[PDB]
Every structure is written in C-alpha cells, then in structure tokens.
Amino acid sequence: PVDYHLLMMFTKAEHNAPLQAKARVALSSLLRLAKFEAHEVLNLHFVSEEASREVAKALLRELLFKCKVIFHDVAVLTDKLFPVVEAMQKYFSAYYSDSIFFLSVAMHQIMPKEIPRIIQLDLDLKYKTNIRELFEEFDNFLPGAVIGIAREMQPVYRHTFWQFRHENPKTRVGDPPPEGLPGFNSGVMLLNLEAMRQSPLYSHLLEPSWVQQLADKYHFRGHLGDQDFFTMIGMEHPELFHVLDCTWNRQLCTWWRDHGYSDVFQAYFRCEGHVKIYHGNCNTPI
C-alpha cells in the first residue's frame, strides 16, 4: 500500500454556520473528484478539538480506494509546537495558545517520521480536479526544495515590507509576478517533511537568532503567522520553495483592490489558465 496524506485545520466549528458551509463545499468537491488506485490509500488528518471533532466525523459520513480519517488533538499539537515556535510569534503574529498557527513551519517535527510528505489545506477551498494530481508536484521539486507553495495574489506584501522597499527601491521583495516576489499564500502547502528534516538551511532558519536576524533585515512585523515565515524565508532563499502554478490555488479575495491598491492589483491577482483549486479567502464566494 502507498499513503497520501492531507492535513486540515478544523477548529471552533461548533455552532459555526459559515465555517460548516465552507467545509461542505471543500470536502464534497475533494471526495467527489478524488480518485486513487486500489493498492494506495488517502489519509485525511484533522486538527480539531473534541467539539469540532464531532462536527467533522458527522460531516464525513454524508460523503463516505480506502480513505483513513485521522484526528489530531489541537492541544497536544499546540503543546508540542510551543517550545519550537515561541521565538517567531513575536515577528509573524506581532500568547501561548496561538502556537498552532505555526504548525506548517514545524510539521516535520510534529508528524511521525513514518510520514515523508503531507499537503496542508485550507477549508475555504473548492477542488476542480483529482487531488492525486497535486501530489505529482512533489516530483517537480528541485533537490534542496522543501515546500510547495502558491504565490500570494494580493499586494499584501507591498504593505508589509513597506520599510524594506522604501530603503531598497530596486528590490523585487513585494513586487508582482513573474519578475517580482509577491510572497506566498498558505491555503495549499506541499510540505516535504523528509526534505524538511534533512535540509540544514531549513533547520537553521527555524532558530531564534536566525529568525531575528532576517526579520530585522526586512523590518518584518506581520500578522499572517506561518504564511509570513515562509514568505520572508522566500525572499532570502527562494530555492527552498517550489512555486506552484497559480491554478493550484486561485485566491478570490479582492479586498485590496478596493482599499488602496486599485492600480497594481491586477498584476498580483492575474492567473490565466484552467483552475484546479479555488480559494475563497476573506469569505469570497465561489
């Protein structure tokens, strides 16, 4: 048998109608279109609390290749994360309870060594293709590339990196694609735990003094959590990241188009081609 792992955040879903609607659109599209071979098996991980764990199990019954469903305890992962991720919530969430928002960053240390690869996914997504196809992007990784991640389709990182761009007028940090680095979106993340455990550079970029050094270089104080870490790391060492085509995560949020970036917005939001996964971020309907 061959294992394919997906991870999803499903916290505070109890008495949440907007969230449960999203998780219905997401999980229904995922499973209705997901097709695997008979020997191999799809593993669906969830980090949820006892309360939302019930909500998930109840939702999966309506929608059930074998597909094993694993539930991770929110508190257990948080408690495991905290000693590793304390020194970077003061830069990317600029107190203890909010350690679970940096899960992707330390996925290799939290997950068992038995798991070599995982795809962490948002629940405001809509799947337009078979999810087995996305796993094929792992093969397109360069050696020394640890994370598969789609680029950010809003000029958020213009505003976040403002002081660095103010000081470096020639920089590509915060610039639109294809010539510039717009930053990353955390909605669809291909985490190569095997590569993460083995990459010395990534092992060092997780350390406090390194984080401090790099945040200070970019004058970085963000609020986007794990997404902020990868994005900032992506500016220094872009080769750690395998940039997924925009069609694998087409964010639909247009907030910044109407709140300051009307002119440059398109250069970030643009994504030509047949969409494979939609991302209805900032509550944008699909």
Ligand X SMILES: O=c1ccn([C@@H]2O[C@H](COP(=O)(O)OP(=O)(O)O)[C@@H](O)[C@H]2O)c(=O)[nH]1
Binding-site residue ranges for UDP-alpha-D-xylose: 9-11, 123, 186, 224, 227
Shortest Cβ distance from residue 186 to ligand X (Å)? 7
Given a contact cutoff of 8 angstroms between Cβ atoms, the answer to whether 156 and 115 are in contact is: no
**CA distances (Å), origin 56, targets 144, 189, 270:** 36, 21, 34
Q: Under rule CB under 6 A, how many of the chain's residues touch ligand X?
A: 12
Q: How far is the CB of 53 from Mn ion (least distance, A)?
A: 20
For ligand X, which stretch binds (CB under 6 A), given 90-98, 122-130, 163-171, 261-269? Answer: 122-130
Where does this chain touch ligand X (CB under 6 A) — which range of 11-19, 32-40, 102-110, 237-245?
11-19
Secondary structure (DSSP) of 23-87: HHHHHHHHHHH----SS-EEEEEEEE-HHHHHHHHHHHTTT--EEEEEEEEHHHHHHHHHHHHGG
DSSP secondary-structure letter at 106?
Answer: G
Whose Cβ is closer to ligand X: residue 8's or residue 44's? Answer: 8
CB of 8 to ligand X, least distance (A): 6
175 scored as a contact of Mn ion (CB under 5 A): no
Peptide bond into 178 cis (omega under 30): yes
Supply φ then ψ for residue 96, to 5 degrees.
Answer: -70, -40
Cα–Cα distance measured from residue 218 to residue 72, given in angstroms and rounded to the nearest whole number = 35
For residue 178, the one-letter residue type is: P
Give residues 17-36 in contact with ligand X (rule: CB under 6 A): 19
| Identity of the residue, 117 or 279, whose beta carbon is nearer to ligand X in the bound complex | 279
* Interruption sites in the chain after residues (C→N beyond 2.5 Å): 64, 94
- Minimum Å distance from CB 154 to Mn ion? 12
Please select the residue that binds ligand X; options are 176, 182, 187, 222, rule is CB under 6 A. 187
Q: Considering only residues 262-281, where is the footprint of Mn ion by CB under 5 A?
A: 281
Nearer to Mn ion, 182 or 187 (CB): 187
The reply to whether 226 sits near ligand X by the rule CB under 6 A is no
Contact (CB, 8 A) for 164 and 173: yes
Interface positions with ligand X (CB under 6 A): 8-12, 19, 122-124, 187, 281-282
